[PDB]
Write a protein that binds this ligand. Sequence first.
Ligand SMILES: [Mg+2]
Ligand SMILES: [Mg+2]
Lengths: 189, 146, 52, 67, 145, 57, 73, 64, 55, 143
Amino acid sequence: DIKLFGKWSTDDVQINDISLQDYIAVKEKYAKYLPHSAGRYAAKRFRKAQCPIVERLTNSMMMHGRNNGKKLMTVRIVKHAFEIIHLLTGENPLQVLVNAIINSGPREDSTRIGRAGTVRRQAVDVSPLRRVNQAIWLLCTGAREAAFRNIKTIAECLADELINAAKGSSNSYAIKKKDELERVAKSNR
Amino acid sequence: MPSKGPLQSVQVFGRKKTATAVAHCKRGNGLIKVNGRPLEMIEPRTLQYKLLEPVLLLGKERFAGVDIRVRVKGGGHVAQIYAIRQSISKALVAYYQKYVDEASKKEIKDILIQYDRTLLVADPRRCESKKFGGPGARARYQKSYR
Amino acid sequence: TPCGEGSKTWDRFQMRIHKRLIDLHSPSEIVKQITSISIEPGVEVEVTIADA
Amino acid sequence: GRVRTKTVKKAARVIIEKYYTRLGNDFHTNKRVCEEIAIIPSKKLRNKIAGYVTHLMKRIQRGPVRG
Amino acid sequence: MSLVIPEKFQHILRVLNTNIDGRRKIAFAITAIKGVGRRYAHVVLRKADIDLTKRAGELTEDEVERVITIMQNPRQYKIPDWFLNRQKDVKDGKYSQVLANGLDNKLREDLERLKKIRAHRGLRHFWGLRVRGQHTKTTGRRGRT
Amino acid sequence: AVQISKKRKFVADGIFKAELNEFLTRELAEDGYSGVEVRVTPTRTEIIILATRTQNV
Amino acid sequence: KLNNLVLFDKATYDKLCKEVPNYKLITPAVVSERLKIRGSLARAALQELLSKGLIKLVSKHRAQVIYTRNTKG
Amino acid sequence: RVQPIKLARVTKVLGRTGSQGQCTQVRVEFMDDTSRSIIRNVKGPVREGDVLTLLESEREARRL
Amino acid sequence: GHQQLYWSHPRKFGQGSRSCRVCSNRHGLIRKYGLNMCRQCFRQYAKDIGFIKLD
Amino acid sequence: PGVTVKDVNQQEFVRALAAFLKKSGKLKVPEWVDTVKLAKHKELAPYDENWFYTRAASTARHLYLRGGAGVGSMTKIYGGRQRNGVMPSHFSRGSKSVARRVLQALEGLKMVEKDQDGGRKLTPQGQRDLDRIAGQVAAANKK
RNA sequence: CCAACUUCUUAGAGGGACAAGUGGCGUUCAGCCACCCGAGAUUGAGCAAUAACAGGUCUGUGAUGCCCUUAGAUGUCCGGGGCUGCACGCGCGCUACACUGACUGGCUCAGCGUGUGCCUACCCUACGCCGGCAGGCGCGGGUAACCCGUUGAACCCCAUUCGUGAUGGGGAUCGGGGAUUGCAAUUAUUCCCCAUGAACGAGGAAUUCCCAGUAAGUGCGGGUCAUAAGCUUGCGUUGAUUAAG
Ligand SMILES: [Mg+2]
Ligand SMILES: [Mg+2]
């Protein structure tokens, strides 16, 4: 109805995990034309969940200082990367992102300050917003360290990892590394 | 030629950090431009949908009896397109409380409030000065001990 | 600080000076008694030349 | 951060002890009365005193407060 | 326009004493010459009336000769006088662009000249010191041992 | 001659005001000085002391 | 793990014009690593295939040019 | 041995824990009965009433 | 003396000629707005100048 | 209908107007045009070899929008950011004697005149034909 | 009067928000947590106690005790030199290690502020004409909401070229030249041009600042100033990831 970046309406997209229906904000109440809005989200907590994930995917993309406030420069990175996605697949690219949000967010990790077995010891669960935060952080990081010495564009290297993570193959960085979290959480489970 | 309906118009401003944009809008026939040039012909164009966004979810042919034109002063390239987005939203909102019923104004404010309230409320946050001990407003120079 | 020792403090003096401006089409002789209404130690008044 | 100082509470108690015949449970009316009937040096503690008065308005219509 | 390649393509050329790479393009291929910078190379080519987008191994030997001929004595091909290296040289009074081992000749000659008459610039060349008035209390460490 | 700007009008009279306050401290200290107060006019300008022992000045 | 080559041989150019207008995503960053050309030709040769009529243009951005296969059915 | 990866909704949050203020005790309910309810500890921001997914369900809570 | 070259070095441009009218120092003085007072010197009289702080 | 220049895409209006000035070979192009570097905050030559027409198209279009503009203000609109090597970068002015040579060039082309005060405006002969090719290139968006 | 008016701009006065309203919690005490209305439901800084420090500053001061020295003077002036000297170690900081880039050309946006002086010379600069560049002249304006200036700031944006290579990344080092300031530029003042093209591939232990227009990017203006900012103190621009423990 609102057609994020002018096309690809957000009616067909379906969030499969009930654990993340309150936290991924693709639906029509929180569906915009393009991911740019004056935020005001770290005034009070738990309103960064009704911030749309395309806004949170393009805010977590400007990272390493040299490209740090360049938000109109990363809003075209996501704009083309949906369009690379639709050519390799033929899916509404909002759906293949929200599969990668499910598939890359972990389920176990660990915390101790004391007598560190491997890194952290008491293996704890995860709240279902940190697994979204560590979904997009795992996607944006892994798309980035795999285009630092590469002829490949950061636009395609973004696209070619999250459809590689939405399918789930340990071939993207967001899948092959998240398993090391749950492995080492099993190693001190 | 002032022969019919003299000065049936409003002039409404909207603001961004270090910016303003006051939209003069008369009675007329579907004409919108910013500093002379049209709305689809604006400079950034990556943010093209969110300055013709009050056109989109309101309706072109429906609300084309008005001849909005905007002058913009101060700020920067992103703050001056949120300025005209806020302005011409609340320009024709302020135009309908004066020349038609507010039954239509509440009918169009109903769209523009469930859809991201900032179109006719001013974003209050501003520059927030630097202090005398750091390179920025909160940050400080690197403390050394040895 | 008078010296270099300290923890990098700074005092920011300022002086805000206001100024207002008023026109009259008066005959330029009675402006002398308009000046001579009061002494008023705070203000600084100046009358523009009568050659317009 | 809401919690009100000793001079707001003390000076508001001397109103309701003394001018209860003129006050009510509206903020904007009592804000005008305490302006007229006390000498408040500035506007912020004018309507910060008057807020505790109206808080004392619903409080004393129930029972024996320090009243 | 080369959809495949023409029949001859030099892997490396042979220019003055420097063998330039052939996969570069001519604006940036001849910059291996000590004396031909990134700036002087484009100016010679525009006076050579060549297309700047042509690659290096696909110039015929007339073009390679005409590029070498212009940069040997550019003072008559209307390249201006404060665009050259040796403006008003301190031994002969001429204006010349130097491009070869002769660049390093006139490079070192000024060192040993000042070292001969013992100017303060030449004494800091004879040692391992900085010339252009830098500090040395804290920098330039890994030149000396 | 030519007159100088309003920013440097207002630091000139203050450093006028600061200077004679420092001298009239040094003179009238034994006679109970306690300040001055100035009036600039486009005439005779009138400067008043605030001495306590006005008999001694 | 190092240098590729500019100015196509015959063995890549016929290999280009047989399968590079077939698959679904095609970009100068793709053929400068799927083939042994280095790029700058990936832009140059894939530009003139748009001139022939073998592929379609989508994006045409200064940082990213995106092509695809042509209409088959 | 092989357990279902079970989802479970939280009741009242039992405050922070974990010696840095990093873990929150939640007391989940297992979506099929509210009578079966184990106290567990998650990290990150919680929001009472939502649903989180256990990778393995019953091991241990905080008691010395 | 011998007045031809007693005071012969040109006190002109540069901090060999700027001085504090009030304190007679040449270091750190403030030549903004024609003050020409010593910076250490500036703090004393700044209330007498008419320079208030924030309050 | 009546289409002026303000409602046309003006990155490529310059691409239209420079293509007019090249085929209308009535421009006094200076003799040092190929060794220029264009305002010393940049370190290479201009890439396009006939850069003087797209400078003349650009310096005419701003002069349409800004009256009274001299060579001193034309250097404040073609300037950019000089990287100073190891020191912090700073803004620097444009080039004076290439902005002078283009305004004198348009004066022989009769599209600019001097003013009552300092600076230059354009004659009604000047605007009547860059609005003419403004209508062409707005039609060339469809064509 | 050959028009009116104050939305935008600059102020001045008064207004406005109080945890007030409404649920929930709480001894139904203080208050807390939620919301509605609202521009705003914690804007940011100043001042800032008692008692102290053998903290710093006698090289800031005609604030000052005591001592020392007082003419072959520790006074003062003048000429040169040094405070920049380098086998090394440390602390602030700039530029980077590139393709989310660098070029080249288009394109459009700021705010804070400062400007000709008693001594004390010298200011901000429009415009025109020479110069390929710094700059050089002629001619104006401004003691300033009067002029520079509608401060066409940079990043960003659009097209171009370059292709994972210590490469057009990076620009240290170094040679030759041209100009400006000055009594004087050598131990290079700065600036400009050509040429030269060094480490450097995200940095071990350790450690710093910060939680919203914040961090950070990016430029701009004060101070110093004859010449001058890699420093400082201010400004706007772009603008967040994390967190309410
Ligand atoms: Mg002293
Ligand atoms: Mg690379």
